[PDB]
Amino acid sequence: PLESQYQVGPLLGSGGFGSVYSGIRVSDNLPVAIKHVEKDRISDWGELPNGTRVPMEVVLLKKVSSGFSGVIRLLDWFERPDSFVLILERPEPVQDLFDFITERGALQEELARSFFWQVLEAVRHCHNCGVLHRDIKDENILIDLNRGELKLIDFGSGALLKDTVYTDFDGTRVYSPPEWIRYHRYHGRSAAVWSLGILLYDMVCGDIPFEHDEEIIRGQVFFRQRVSSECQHLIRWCLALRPSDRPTFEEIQNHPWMQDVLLPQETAEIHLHS
């Protein structure tokens, strides 16, 4: 074992998530992402079923890794004196949703429907596993371009799912709900639905709807692109000011705009040119 198991390629990126390198597993040529997180830079810690002290990110990733391909899976992890190394799966070719939107602008509704539906299934999987991502946004969504499959990344600001109030939030501000801005308090599910509202607007308009605190609190949504009445309704419902007025995941998926979604492979053939 140790670090004989992987061949380290080029740097893919770095930021609040750490430093991530392209990699290959020598056991079977499998593409992987090798993410290094410094110990002195993590605030949230937890324990694994085995009973070890690891970054919360690892706890959460282990809980959501398995069968479902809607989340980038943790294949293994290692501990070093000053850091933790995470071996994640690496689809290829791939592009994150932020870059995808920057390049193509506002997405056609058929495409946004397929993408949004997949994000919903991924978030449901997380929540079923007892995990709350807390930073759902375009930058944290990877598109497997050949299969048309979306994958959720970066659980570094996540938390165990609970039914009581959360008083901490280290996720992206502009995707944060009015109740966090005004009271420094939110519940998991309704805060997640707010972020999904921001994400859907972003997909169909090419940018997020709110820039400033005052705009988030006012909750008035202006559309900069042509968007169907049904899509506008769903977005406005997800962005309801009162947490209890937002839809549940089931209500989102049963909404008229969400019906007749394309399959991932279909989405890729029609829109990603597979």
C-alpha positions in Angstrom: 0.0 0.0 0.0 1.1 3.6 0.8 1.4 5.8 -2.4 2.6 3.0 -4.8 -1.1 2.4 -5.7 -1.5 5.5 -7.9 0.3 7.3 -10.7 -0.1 11.0 -10.1 -1.0 13.2 -13.1 -1.4 16.9 -13.5 -3.2 19.3 -11.2 -6.9 19.7 -12.1 -7.7 22.5 -9.6 -7.4 24.1 -6.1 -9.5 26.3 -3.8 -11.6 25.9 -0.7 -11.8 22.1 -1.4 -8.0 21.6 -1.4 -5.7 20.6 -4.3 -6.9 17.9 -6.7 -4.6 15.9 -9.1 -5.5 13.7 -12.1 -4.6 10.2 -11.3 -4.7 6.6 -12.4 -5.0 3.4 -10.3 -2.3 1.0 -11.3 -4.4 -2.0 -10.1 -6.7 -1.7 -13.2 -6.0 1.6 -15.1 -9.1 3.2 -13.5 -9.2 7.0 -13.8 -9.2 8.8 -10.3 -9.0 12.2 -8.8 -6.5 12.6 -5.9 -7.6 15.3 -3.5 -5.3 16.6 -0.8 -6.9 18.4 2.3 -4.6 20.0 4.8 -5.3 19.2 8.5 -4.8 22.8 9.6 -7.5 24.0 7.2 -10.5 21.7 8.3 -12.9 22.9 10.9 -15.6 20.2 10.9 -14.5 16.7 12.1 -16.5 13.5 12.7 -16.0 9.7 13.1 -16.5 6.7 10.9 -18.5 3.6 11.7 -15.1 2.1 12.7 -14.6 4.9 15.2 -11.8 7.1 13.8 -11.3 10.9 13.7 -11.6 12.0 10.1 -12.7 15.2 8.3 -16.5 15.4 8.0 -16.0 15.3 4.2 -14.8 11.7 4.5 -17.6 10.7 6.9 -20.2 12.1 4.5 -18.6 10.7 1.3 -18.5 7.2 2.8 -22.2 7.4 3.7 -23.1 8.3 0.0 -20.6 6.1 -1.8 -22.0 2.8 -3.4 -24.5 1.9 -6.2 -25.6 5.4 -7.2 -23.7 7.3 -9.8 -25.3 10.6 -9.0 -22.5 11.4 -6.6 -18.7 11.2 -7.3 -17.7 8.2 -5.1 -14.8 8.0 -2.6 -12.8 4.9 -3.5 -10.2 5.1 -0.7 -8.5 7.6 1.6 -5.2 8.0 3.4 -3.9 9.8 6.4 -0.6 11.7 6.5 1.0 13.8 9.4 -0.3 17.1 8.0 -3.1 16.1 5.6 -5.7 13.6 4.3 -5.6 12.3 0.8 -9.0 11.3 -0.8 -9.2 9.0 -3.9 -12.3 9.9 -5.8 -13.7 8.6 -9.1 -12.9 10.6 -12.3 -15.3 10.4 -15.2 -13.8 11.3 -18.6 -14.4 13.5 -20.5 -15.9 15.9 -18.0 -16.9 19.5 -17.4 -18.5 21.2 -14.4 -21.9 22.9 -14.8 -20.5 26.4 -14.1 -18.0 26.1 -17.1 -20.7 24.5 -19.2 -23.1 27.4 -18.7 -20.3 30.0 -19.1 -19.6 28.5 -22.5 -23.1 27.9 -23.8 -25.1 30.4 -21.9 -28.7 29.8 -20.7 -29.7 26.2 -21.3 -32.7 25.1 -23.3 -35.5 23.9 -21.0 -35.3 20.3 -22.2 -31.7 20.2 -21.2 -32.2 22.0 -17.9 -35.0 19.6 -17.1 -32.8 16.6 -17.6 -29.9 18.1 -15.6 -32.2 19.4 -12.8 -34.0 16.0 -12.5 -30.6 14.3 -12.1 -29.5 16.8 -9.4 -32.8 16.1 -7.6 -32.2 12.3 -7.7 -28.6 12.9 -6.3 -29.8 15.1 -3.5 -32.5 12.6 -2.6 -29.8 9.9 -2.5 -27.7 12.0 -0.2 -30.7 12.8 2.1 -31.6 9.0 2.2 -28.1 8.3 3.3 -28.3 10.8 6.2 -26.3 13.5 4.3 -26.9 17.2 3.6 -24.5 18.7 1.0 -25.2 22.3 1.9 -23.4 23.8 -1.1 -25.5 22.7 -4.1 -24.4 25.0 -7.0 -23.1 24.8 -10.6 -19.5 24.6 -9.6 -20.2 21.5 -7.5 -21.9 19.6 -10.3 -19.8 17.6 -12.9 -21.2 16.5 -16.2 -20.0 13.2 -17.7 -20.2 14.5 -21.3 -20.4 11.1 -23.0 -23.1 9.6 -20.8 -25.1 12.8 -20.0 -24.8 12.0 -16.3 -24.5 14.6 -13.6 -22.4 14.0 -10.5 -22.3 15.9 -7.2 -18.9 17.0 -5.7 -17.3 18.7 -2.7 -19.0 17.7 0.5 -16.5 19.8 2.5 -19.2 22.1 3.8 -21.8 19.3 4.4 -23.4 17.9 7.5 -25.2 14.9 8.9 -28.9 15.4 8.1 -31.0 16.3 11.1 -34.5 17.6 11.7 -33.4 20.4 14.1 -32.1 23.9 13.3 -28.7 24.5 11.8 -26.8 27.6 13.1 -23.7 27.2 11.0 -23.2 27.6 7.2 -19.9 27.6 5.3 -21.5 27.1 1.9 -21.8 29.6 -0.9 -23.6 32.8 0.2 -25.5 33.6 -3.0 -27.1 30.2 -2.8 -28.0 30.7 0.9 -31.6 31.3 2.0 -33.2 34.4 3.4 -33.6 32.7 6.8 -29.8 32.3 7.0 -29.3 36.0 6.1 -31.9 37.4 8.6 -31.6 34.9 11.5 -28.5 32.7 11.1 -30.9 29.7 11.3 -32.2 27.2 8.8 -33.6 23.7 8.4 -31.8 21.2 6.1 -34.5 20.3 3.5 -36.0 23.7 3.0 -32.5 25.3 2.7 -31.6 22.6 0.1 -34.8 23.5 -1.9 -33.8 27.2 -1.8 -30.4 26.3 -3.3 -32.2 24.1 -6.0 -34.3 27.2 -6.9 -31.1 29.2 -7.4 -29.6 26.4 -9.4 -32.6 26.0 -11.7 -32.7 29.8 -12.3 -29.0 29.6 -13.1 -29.5 26.8 -15.7 -32.4 28.6 -17.6 -31.1 32.2 -17.3 -27.3 31.7 -17.5 -26.7 33.4 -14.1 -27.9 33.4 -10.5 -30.9 35.6 -9.7 -29.6 37.4 -6.6 -26.3 39.1 -6.0 -26.8 41.0 -2.8 -28.3 40.3 0.7 -31.1 42.8 0.1 -32.2 41.0 -3.1 -32.2 37.5 -1.3 -34.4 39.0 1.5 -36.8 40.7 -0.9 -37.2 37.4 -2.8 -38.5 39.0 -6.0 -37.3 37.0 -9.0 -36.7 38.8 -12.3 -36.2 36.7 -15.5 -33.5 37.9 -17.9 -34.2 35.1 -20.5 -37.4 33.7 -22.0 -38.5 31.0 -19.5 -41.8 29.1 -19.7 -44.5 30.0 -17.2 -44.4 26.5 -15.7 -40.6 26.8 -15.1 -41.0 30.3 -13.7 -43.6 28.9 -11.3 -41.4 26.0 -10.1 -38.5 28.4 -9.5 -40.6 31.0 -7.6 -42.0 28.1 -5.5 -38.5 26.9 -4.6 -37.5 30.5 -3.8 -40.5 31.1 -1.4 -39.4 33.5 1.3 -41.0 31.4 4.1 -39.2 28.0 4.4 -42.6 26.2 5.0 -44.0 27.5 1.7 -41.2 25.8 -0.4 -41.9 22.4 -2.1 -40.6 19.1 -0.9 -38.5 17.0 -3.2 -41.6 15.0 -4.2 -43.5 18.1 -5.0 -40.7 19.3 -7.2 -40.5 16.1 -9.1 -44.3 15.9 -9.5 -44.4 19.5 -10.9 -45.8 19.9 -14.4 -42.5 21.3 -15.7 -40.6 18.2 -14.6 -42.6 15.7 -16.5 -41.3 13.7 -19.6 -37.6 14.1 -18.7 -35.1 12.7 -21.1 -32.8 9.8 -20.1 -29.1 10.6 -19.6 -27.9 9.0 -22.8 -30.7 10.8 -24.8 -29.6 14.0 -23.2 -26.0 13.5 -24.3 -27.0 12.5 -27.9 -29.3 15.5 -28.4 -27.4 18.2 -26.4 -23.8 17.1 -25.7 -23.2 15.7 -29.2 -22.4 12.1 -28.2 
